[PDB]
């Protein structure tokens, strides 16, 4: 019962806003989402979390994650996307249940051109 990250690939042109959708089986209703960017060497970078944690070391208004009123899914948006931003992105859900697993979604690609 892991989350799913869509679309498999979206392209935007050196600016504007690019948004992905991550959907999850919100059973417990007491959990956290992380939004990661995986480097070409399979190294991961944590871009955001819902709910938000701290804006000190992790300061970047570029990546917003917002919850939609339906509850099942969430929007992962990069605002005004620089060409540095193009890369492979992934979703991750964690449930605070005593096992505290991290259910993990699939890759998704993002391009920026024009």
């Amino acid at each position, epitope marked *: 019962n892991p989350p799913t990250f869509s679309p498999a690939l979206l392209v935007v042109t050196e600016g504007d806003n690019a948004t992905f959708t991550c959907s999850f089986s919100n059973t417990s209703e007491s959990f*956290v989402l*992380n939004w990661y*960017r995986m480097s070409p*060497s*399979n*190294q*991961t*970078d*944590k*871009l*955001a*979390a819902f709910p938000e*944690d*701290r804006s*000190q*070391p*992790g*300061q*970047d208004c570029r*990546f917003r994650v917002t919850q939609l009123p339906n509850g099942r899914d969430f929007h992962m948006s990069v605002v005004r996307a620089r060409r540095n931003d193009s890369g492979t992105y992934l979703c991750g859900a*964690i449930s*605070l249940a005593p*096992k*505290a*697993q*991290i259910k993990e979604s699939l890759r998704a690609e993002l391009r920026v051109t024009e």
Partner: antibody, heavy 118, light 108 residues
Framework: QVQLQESGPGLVKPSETLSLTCTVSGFSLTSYGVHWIRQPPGKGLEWIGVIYADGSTNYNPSLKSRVTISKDTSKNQVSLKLSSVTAADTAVYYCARAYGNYWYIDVWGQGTTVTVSS | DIVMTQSPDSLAVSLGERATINCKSSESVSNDVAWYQQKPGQPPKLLIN???HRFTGVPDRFSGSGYGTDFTLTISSLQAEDVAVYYC?????????FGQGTKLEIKR
């Protein structure tokens, strides 16, 4: 090949100013923050400070104002200066890279050992 | 500040068995905890990042779990090349403190 190498005096006399340098290969200091971490003999790791990508610094309060971290990107070099040292400061000093937004320390230098002694 | 406390201080487990080291935070930290191993004379090397993620290139027997205040490093089938000291490290609020370290020695 993301690399950090430290260099500095192996012996400093007490109350001197101790200066170490960390030369970087495989990334630019404009995009990555660099931390200085310290390890006394047989003791644990102590976080000294960090210079972020932009250039804002942040130190450990136990080093109230004796510590200063700077960088020169042209030389790919990060420098640590600690004033008014005592024998409580002899330790191995590592420089290390912080990776990603919401960061973690991934690559460590080999560490250079500094002894404070008259 | 924030103090990370590891348990136990030292730990001796036979080969092929499972080894767990625990790390607890005074102030709640939301998964910004990394596990590093360090053997004598070499620098610390990163094992786990983001409390759960196995870093790139580190063997499959290393795993991390936990969130908020309780975290566990777990080596599944411990083998000889894992004798070291293990440190948790929080990147949540400055000063970004470390754990005291747990020496993992193996029984033979």
């Amino acid at each position: 090949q993301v690399q950090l190498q430290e260099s500095g005096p192996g012996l400093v006399k007490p109350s001197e100013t101790l200066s170490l340098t960390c030369t970087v290969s495989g990334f630019s200091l404009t995009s990555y923050g660099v931390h200085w971490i310290r390890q006394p003999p047989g003791k644990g790791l102590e976080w000294i400070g960090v210079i972020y990508a932009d250039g804002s610094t942040n130190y450990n309060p136990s080093l109230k104002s004796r510590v200063t971290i700077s960088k020169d990107t042209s030389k790919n070099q990060v420098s640590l200066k600690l004033s008014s040292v005592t024998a409580a400061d002899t330790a191995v000093y590592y420089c290390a890279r912080a990776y990603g937004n919401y960061w973690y320390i991934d690559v460590w230098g080999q560490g250079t050992t500094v002894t404070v002694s008259s | 500040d924030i103090v990370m406390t590891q348990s136990p201080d030292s730990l001796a487990v036979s080969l092929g068995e499972r080894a767990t080291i625990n790390c607890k935070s005074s102030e709640s930290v939301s998964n910004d905890v990394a596990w590093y191993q360090q053997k004598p004379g070499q620098p610390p090397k990163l094992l786990i990042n983001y409390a759960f993620h196995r870093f790139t290139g580190v063997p499959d027997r290393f795993s991390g779990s936990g969130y908020g205040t309780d975290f566990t490093l777990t080596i599944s089938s411990l083998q000889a090349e894992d004798v070291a000291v293990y440190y948790c490290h929080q990147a949540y609020s400055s000063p970004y403190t470390f754990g005291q370290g747990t020496k993992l020695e193996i029984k033979r």
